[PDB]
Amino acid sequence: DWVVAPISVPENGKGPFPQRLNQLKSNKDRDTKIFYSITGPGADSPPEGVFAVEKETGWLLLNKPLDREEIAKYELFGHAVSENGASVEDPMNISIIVTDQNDHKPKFTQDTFRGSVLEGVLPGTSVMQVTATDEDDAIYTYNGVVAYSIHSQEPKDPHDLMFTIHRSTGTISVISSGLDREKVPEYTLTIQATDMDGDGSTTTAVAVVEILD
Amino acid sequence: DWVVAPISVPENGKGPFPQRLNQLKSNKDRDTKIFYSITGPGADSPPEGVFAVEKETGWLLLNKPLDREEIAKYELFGHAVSENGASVEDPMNISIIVTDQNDHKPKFTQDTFRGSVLEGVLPGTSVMQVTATDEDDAIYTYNGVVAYSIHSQEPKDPHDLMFTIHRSTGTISVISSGLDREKVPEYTLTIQATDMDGDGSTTTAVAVVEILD
Ligand SMILES: [Ca+2]
Ligand SMILES: [Ca+2]
Ligand SMILES: [Ca+2]
Ligand SMILES: [Ca+2]
Ligand SMILES: [Ca+2]
Ligand SMILES: [Ca+2]
Ligand SMILES: [Ca+2]
Ligand SMILES: [Ca+2]
Ligand SMILES: [Ca+2]
Ligand SMILES: [Cl-]
Ligand SMILES: [Cl-]
Ligand SMILES: [Cl-]
Ligand SMILES: [Cl-]
DSSP states (O other), X not given: OOOOOOEEEESSOOOOSSEEEEEOOOGGGGTSOEEEEEESBTTTBSSTTSEEEOTTTOEEEEXXXXXXXXXXXXXXXXXXXXXXXXXXXXXXXXXXXXXXXXXXXXXESOSEEEEXXXXXXXXXXXXXXXXXXXXXXXXXXSTTOOEEEEEEXXXXXXXXXXXXXXXXXXXXXXXXXXXXTTTOOEEEEEEEEETGXXXXXXXXXXXXXXXXX | OOOOOOEEEESSOOOOSSEEEEXXXXXXXXXXXXXXXXXSBTTTBSSTTSEEEOTTTOEXXXXXXXXXXXXXXXXXXXXXXXXXXXXXXXXXXXXXXXXXOOOOXXXXXXXXXXXXXXXXXXXXXXXXXOOEEOOSOOXXXXXXXXXXXXXXXXXXXXXXXXXXXXTTTOEEEEOSSOOOTTTOOEEEEEXXXXXXXXXXXXXXXXXXXXXXX
16 A cells, blocks of 8 residues: 655754644545544653644644654554544554754763773783763764763873773773883873764763772 | 552652662562563653663662653553563553653743723723643642733833733733823733742743724
8 A cells, every 4th residue: 555654853853843744645535524633652642742633634743852862763543534433544554763863972881980900011901991872873873973082191100191092992001111000000091982983072081090010 | 459559750850860669579589580570651662761670679760850741640560470481470550650840931822912902991991811821730739820910011101001910810901091092002011921820930922902993
């Protein structure tokens, strides 16, 4: 059968609302006045009233802004009933696909990550790994693709930039010589995660690196 | 049967999340390891993952802040399954009632209301009626109870306060003499609606009153 195609709607629309999405129609409206209605989650069950349909015109409406991270797909049914009260079509599946906007900053899995490394390891040695997640799409876009960096290191002793971070994996490594527990037994690294693979919003956290004997 | 009572949770909770709500338990856990799960809108169907249950402990969790004006009541089912894979209880109804916080300001049904009145009507004469709605509860609290007032009138001719408004019905009336079309053919009233029956947040709109001949 011919049916309404899935309707794609970006999250966070500015309106105005109610917003026309697509117009339902039964061709039995030639012979009879038709009253349209819709059912399903988002229409007549939780969350109720996100979508509506204009009874006589068959216009499907979105009544407010959508949030992909709450519900990314709605599955509704359109109905068509004659003025005398008989259903004149089998209910039609209607799908609404909510598409992404970059509206989440990255979120570190901890506020303070802790790791350790032996003084005197080779430059290039992995120390630890930090992680930030991002609720946004990372399949079709970079909205949810996190890039990692180190913002600063304290103390600046002996050299200011003792560590680096793999920009995609969040693994922190030693890139210099000169680790010495007796001189500096612990470093605090301000670490950052930025979405749009580096071009977007940035969140900050801390990694503390204990220098072992 | 003994069952879990409806669980009341105010909207807009500050957490931390996940938040323990109530602990499910089958007393067959004496004889057998039990795995708990929950189903329904808010758990395994849209909106998915608002609630969860700890598999072994039976703790029901709320995972994020709720919004009474989106969904005010959730109807879930708790399940109890033995480690060998048999259901050992009939699923239990679980209700979550989301209680109100005053988080909506009043909203006027129009930005500009228009009415008219004959010059020379008696003081006390009704002119028009304006309306603001408020999404918040108005049954148990004043969160959704709107009080109306007039903020100002332009021009201030002949007297500054020609009209009043019924603080609950939003009906505007003439309270002075001296309406005269040839002198002032139209007035603009800045009107306000405030929730908590006057004690709360205030929204503003305009009513324009044409003086008829
Ligand atoms: Ca969103
Ligand atoms: Ca929501
Ligand atoms: Ca998003
Ligand atoms: Ca993002
Ligand atoms: Ca030493
Ligand atoms: Ca709310
Ligand atoms: Ca509320
Ligand atoms: Ca309110
Ligand atoms: Ca005159
Ligand atoms: Cl209509
Ligand atoms: Cl998308
Ligand atoms: Cl558990
Ligand atoms: Cl309430």
